[PDB]
Amino acid sequence: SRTSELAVGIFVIIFGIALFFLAMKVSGLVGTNLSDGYTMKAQFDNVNGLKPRAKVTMSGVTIGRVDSITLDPVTRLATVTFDLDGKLTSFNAEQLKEVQKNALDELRYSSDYTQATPAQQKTMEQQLISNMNSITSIDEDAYIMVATNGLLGEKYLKIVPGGGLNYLKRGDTISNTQGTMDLEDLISKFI
Amino acid sequence: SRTSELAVGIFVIIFGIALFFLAMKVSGLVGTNLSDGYTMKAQFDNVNGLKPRAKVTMSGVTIGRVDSITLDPVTRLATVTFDLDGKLTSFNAEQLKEVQKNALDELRYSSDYTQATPAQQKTMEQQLISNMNSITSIDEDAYIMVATNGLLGEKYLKIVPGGGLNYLKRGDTISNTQGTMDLEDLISKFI
Amino acid sequence: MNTIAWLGRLVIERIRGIGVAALMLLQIIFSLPSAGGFGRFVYQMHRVGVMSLLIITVSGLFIGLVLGLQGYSILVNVGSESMLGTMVSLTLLRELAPVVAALLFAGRAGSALTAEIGSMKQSEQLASMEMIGVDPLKQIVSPRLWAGIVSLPMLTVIFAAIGIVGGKLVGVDFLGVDEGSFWSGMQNNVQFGHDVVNGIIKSIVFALLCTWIAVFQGYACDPTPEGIATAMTRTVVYSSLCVLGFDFVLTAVMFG
Amino acid sequence: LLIITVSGLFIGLVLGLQGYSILVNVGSESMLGTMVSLTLLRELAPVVAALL
Ligand SMILES: CCCCCC/C=C/CCCCCCCCCC(=O)O[C@H](COC(=O)CCCCCCCCCCCCCCC)COP(=O)(O)OC[C@@H](O)CO
Ligand SMILES: CCCCCC/C=C\CCCCCCCCCC(=O)O[C@H](COC(=O)CCCCCCCCCCCCCCC)COP(=O)(O)OC[C@@H](O)CO
Ligand SMILES: CCCCCC/C=C\CCCCCCCCCC(=O)O[C@H](COC(=O)CCCCCCCCCCCCCCC)COP(=O)(O)OC[C@@H](O)CO
Ligand SMILES: CCCCCC/C=C\CCCCCCCCCC(=O)O[C@H](COC(=O)CCCCCCCCCCCCCCC)COP(=O)(O)OC[C@@H](O)CO
C-alpha cells in the first residue's frame, strides 16, 4: 500500500499549494489583469471624491477602471487617465463592417451629395482606412461625467453616448466633460 | 534540527507577507509621503469635526494634509496649520516664465500702465523679482473652507481659487475662510 | 518521497478514524434503554452541565459588555442609538452565543470528558467491566454522550440572556440611552421563531459534534500517560474546526 | 499554523455573508470592506486567535 500512501500524500500537497496560488489571486496582489486594455484620458474641472482604481460605466455595466489623477497647476484642471476593455468597447470583425456602412451611407446621403464634390466614394476610401485601425465604440460627441452611485455611493465615471458619425481612436482624449457637484454648492446654487 | 530551522523560516516568510498585505493594501500608509512640502496656515471660526491628518484638496486632487488645530484664546478663532506639496502646487522653470510675463501684462496693460508714475518697467521688473523666491499656485484671493465628502463622510479642507493677480509665498496665511456647516447652520441659511 | 509517504499515511488513518467513530455513534443511539440508566444521566448532568456554569456565566457577561460599548460608538454617528438593543440582541442570538459558548464547552467540558474516559482505559476499568459481562459503551459512554447534547443548548440560552443584561447595563445605565426605547426596539425586530429558535437549532448541532468527538477520543485512546494528553488536545482542535465550519453552513441556510 | 489558517478563513466567510445582509438595506454595500476589516482588526482576530 506504499503506492496508496504516495497518491494521497501528493494530492494533499497539490491541493495545499493550489489554494495558496488562489489566495494570492483573490487578494489584490500579483496578477489582476484585463482583456487587452488600452488607455484613454479626459480633463475635468472638479473631480472631488474620485479615487484611483474606481469604476467606469457606459450604460450601467462596468467597462474599465481608473488609473491616475493629476493636477495641472497653471490652468487649474485635473487630468484623469483610465483604461478600458477590448471585449466590451471594440468591434470584433463583423460589427466593424456594420458601423462602417452605416456611417458611410449616412454621410453619402442627399444632404452631403450636393455639399461635397461629385467625385464621391473617394472620401469613402480614405475614411475606411482610418476606421479599421484602432477604433472604439465611443463616438465623437459623447461625454463623460463624475457620478456618485445612488445617494451614498462612492464616486465613478460615466460615459453617456449620443449621436456620432466618427469615433475616437485608442489613446484619444474625450473633449466633452462635466465635473462633479459639491453639496455645499448645491444648497447655495439653490438659495 | 535542519528541518525545524527550515520550517521556522517559512513561518517568518508568511508573517512578512501578511504584514505587507495589512500595511500596503488595507491601510493608508504607502499613500502618505509628501514631496518637499512647505507649510501654510489658516484661521477659522468653526472647525468642528476636523481631525488631524485630514485631507486638503484643490480641484478634487489631494495636495496636502492637516497637522495641528489649536484655539489661540486671545482671539478665539481656531488656527489650522497644514502642509502642502512641492510638485502639484509649486511652479517650475517653464511655468514661472508663463506667469512672469502675464503678471507684467496683467499689470502693464492699457488699464494699469498709467496708474503709477512715468518711470520704466524696472519697478515692473521688481514685480518679477518679487515672485520667483518661493511662490505657490494659490493666489491671494483664494479661499479655503471646511467641507464634507458625501453627506455622512469625514471633513476635509477645500481650496477654491478665484481671480487675483499676485501670488502667495510659501508660509503665508490664507485670509478668506468659512467654517463648517452643521445642521443648525443649514437651517438658518434657508430662512 | 519519504515524508510524502508519511503525509499520505497520516490522512488515511484519519479517514479510517471517522469510520470507527461513525459506527460507534450508531451503536449508542440505536439501542434499547436499560435499568438504572436515568440516574446515571442525572449524575453526568452535574459533571458536564453544572460544572460549566461558572465559565459560561462570566464569559457571557464580559462579551455583552464589549458589544454594548462598541455598538454605541457605531450607532451614535448615524442618529440611531435607539437601535442599540436590536443590534446587541441580534448579534448574540444568531452569531455569538451559539459559537463562543461552543468554544468554551469544547475546552472545559469536552476536554474533561476525554480525560475521564481515557484514564478508565489506562487503569483497565473498561477491560474489567467487559470481562464481567457489561458493555462499557452502554454503562460508561452512553450517559456521557446524552448529558452533553442536553447541557450545551441549555447553556447558550443562559449565555445569551446575560449578554443582553450585560449590554443593557453599559448602554442604558452608563452611556445613557433611553430604557423604554431599548426594550421596545428589541421587541419589534426580534422574532421568536426566526431568531431565538434558530439559535437553539445551531447549538444542538454543535453539541452533537463537540460531544461525539470528545467521547470518541477517550474511548479510542492510547492507554499511556502522554497518549491521553495527546488525545485531550485533539478534542479541542477538532471541535473548534467543526464549530466554525458548520457555522458558515448554518447561517447561509437560516439567514441567507 | 493549520488550525489558525482554516479558522480565519471560515470566520471571514461568515462576516462577509452577514455584513452584506445588513448593509444592502441602507444603500451602503460599498462599506463592506470597511466593516469586514475593522471587525477583524480590532475585535475578532485578537480574541478568537487567542482562544484557539
Ligand atoms: C427566504 C426563506 C426565509 C426563511 C424562512 C424560514 C422562517 C423561519 C422559521 C423557521 C426557521 C427555518 C430555517 C431553516 C431551519 C434549518 C434546519 C436545519 O438546519 O436542519 C438541521 C440540519 O443540520 C445539519 O445537519 C448541518 C446540515 C445543514 C444542511 C441542511 C440543509 C437544510 C435544507 C432543508 C431546510 C429547509 C429550509 C427552510 C427555510 C426556507 C437539523 O437540526 P436539528 O433539528 O437540531 O437536528 C439535530 C442534528 O443533530 C441532526 O440529528
Ligand atoms: C495575502 C494573504 C496572506 C495569507 C498568507 C498565507 C497563509 C498561510 C498559507 C498556508 C499555511 C498552510 C499551513 C501548513 C501547515 C504546516 C504544518 C507542518 O509543517 O508540520 C508538520 C506536520 O504537519 C502535519 O501534521 C500534517 C498536518 C495535517 C495535514 C493536513 C491534512 C488535511 C488536508 C487533507 C484534506 C483536504 C482538505 C479538504 C478539501 C476538500 C511537521 O511534521 P512533524 O512530524 O509534526 O514534526 C517534525 C519535526 O520533528 C522535525 O521536522
Ligand atoms: C425526533 C426524534 C427524537 C430526537 C432524537 C433523534 C436521535 C435518534 C433517536 C434517539 C432515541 C432512540 C431511543 C434509544 C436511545 C438509546 C440511548 C439509550 O438507550 O441510553 C440509555 C440511557 O437512558 C437514556 O435514555 C438517557 C435518558 C434520557 C436522555 C434524554 C432526557 C430528556 C430530557 C430533556 C429533553 C428536552 C425537552 C425539553 C424541551 C423544553 C441506556 O443507557 P444505560 O442504561 O446506562 O446502559 C447500561 C446497561 O446497558 C449496561 O450497564
Ligand atoms: C435574567 C438574566 C438571566 C440570568 C440567570 C442567572 C445566571 C446564573 C447566575 C449565577 C450562576 C452562578 C454559578 C454557580 C456555580 C456553581 C458551581 C458548583 O456548584 O460546583 C460546586 C463547586 O464549585 C466550585 O468549584 C467553587 C467554584 C469556584 C468558586 C468561585 C471563586 C471566585 C469568586 C471569588 C472572587 C470574587 C470575584 C471578584 C469580584 C471583585 C460543586 O462542588 P464539587 O466539590 O466540585 O462537587 C461535589 C459533588 O461531588 C457532590 O456535591
C175 Cβ neighbours under 8 A, 6+ residues apart = C68, C69, C72
**Ligand 2 contact via B17 beta carbon (within 6 Å):** yes
Bridge partner list, B139: B167
Partners of residue A2 in chain C, C-beta under 8 Å: 5
DSSP letter at B30?
Answer: T
- DSSP string across A129-142: HHHHSSEEEEETT-
- DSSP collapsed to 3 states, chain C: CCHHHHHHHHHHHHHHHHHHHHHHHHHHHCCCCCCCHHHHHHHHHHHHHHCCHHHHHHHHHHHHHHHHHHHHHHHCCCCCHHHHHHHHHHHHHHHHHHHHHHHHHCCCCCCCHHHHHHHHHHCCHHHHHHHHCCCHHHHHHHHHHHHHHHHHHHHHHHHHHHHHHHHHHHHHHHHCCCHHHHHHHHHHHCCHHHHHHHHHHHHHHHHHHHHHHHHHHHHCCCCCHHHHHHHHHHHHHHHHHHHHHHHHHHHHHHCC
Partners of residue A5 in chain C, C-beta under 8 Å: 5-6, 8-9, 12
What's the CA-to-centroid distance between C53 and ligand 4, angstroms? 7
C245 Cβ neighbours under 8 A, 6+ residues apart = D10
**Ligand 1 contact via C253 beta carbon (within 6 Å):** yes
Supply C144's cell numbers: 456521557
What is the C-alpha to C-alpha distance for residues C127 and C115, in angstroms, rounded to an integer?
Answer: 17
What's the CA-to-centroid distance between A12 and ligand 2, angstroms? 10
| A156 close contact with B: CB closer than 8 A | no
CA distances from A180 to A158, C116, D6 (A): 11, 71, 45
A vs D: CB pairs below 8 A: 10
| C14 close contact with A: CB closer than 8 A | no
- DSSP collapsed to 3 states, chain D: CHHHHHHHHHHHHHHHHHHHHHHCCCCCHHHHHHHHHHHHHHHHHHHHHHHC
CB atoms C247 and D51 under 8 Å: no
Å from D13 to nearest chain C CA?
7
Supply C222's cell numbers: 492510547
| B151 close contact with A: CB closer than 8 A | yes
Partners of residue A13 in chain C, C-beta under 8 Å: 4, 7
A94-107 vs A122-132: helix axis angle to the nearest 10? 150
Bridge partner list, A78: A44, A71
Candidate of C24, C30, C32, C41 to mutate for ligand 3, largest count of ligand atoms within 8 Å of Cβ: C41
What is the C-alpha to C-alpha distance for residues B121 and B165, in angstroms, rounded to an integer?
Answer: 17
Supply A117's cell numbers: 464634390
Q: What is the CA radius of gyration of chain C?
A: 22
Strands A55-57 and A156-160 turn out to be parallel
Supply B74's cell numbers: 486671545
8 A C-beta contact, residue C219 and residue C117: yes
Residue B130 half-sphere exposure, CB side, CA atoms within 13 Å? Answer: 11
What is the C-alpha to C-alpha distance for residues C219 and C96, in angstroms, rounded to an integer?
Answer: 31
CA distances from A46 to A49, A71, B57 (A): 9, 10, 10
**Ligand 2 contact via B18 beta carbon (within 6 Å):** yes
Query: b or e along B22-46 (b: 16 or more beta carbons within 10 Å of the residue's beta carbon)?
Result: eeeeeeeeeeeeeeebbebebbbeb
8 A C-beta contact, residue C106 and residue C210: yes
- C-alpha closest to that of B66 among B92, B88, B47: B47
8 A C-beta contact, residue C156 and residue C97: yes
At how many Å resolution was this determined?
3.1
Chain centroid to Cα A64, Å, comes to: 5
Q: Whose CA is nearest to atom 48 of ligand 2?
A: B4
8 A C-beta contact, residue A82 and residue A67: yes
What is the C-alpha to C-alpha distance for residues B20 and B15, in angstroms, rounded to an integer?
Answer: 9
Beta-carbon neighbour count of residue D13 at 10 Å?
17
**Ligand 3 contact via C185 beta carbon (within 6 Å):** no
Partners of residue B29 in chain D, C-beta under 8 Å: none
- C-alpha closest to that of C100 among A23, B151, D48: D48
CB atoms D21 and C95 under 8 Å: no
A56 Cβ neighbours under 8 A, 6+ residues apart = A62, A63, A64, A65, A66, A82, A84, A156, A157, A158, A159
Provide the chain C residues 54-113 that lie in CB contact (below 8 A) with chain D.
66, 70, 95, 103, 107
8 A C-beta contact, residue C67 and residue C163: yes
Please identify which residue in the block is written with the cell numbers 461625454: A143
8 A C-beta contact, residue A39 and residue A171: yes
CB atoms C1 and A12 under 8 Å: no
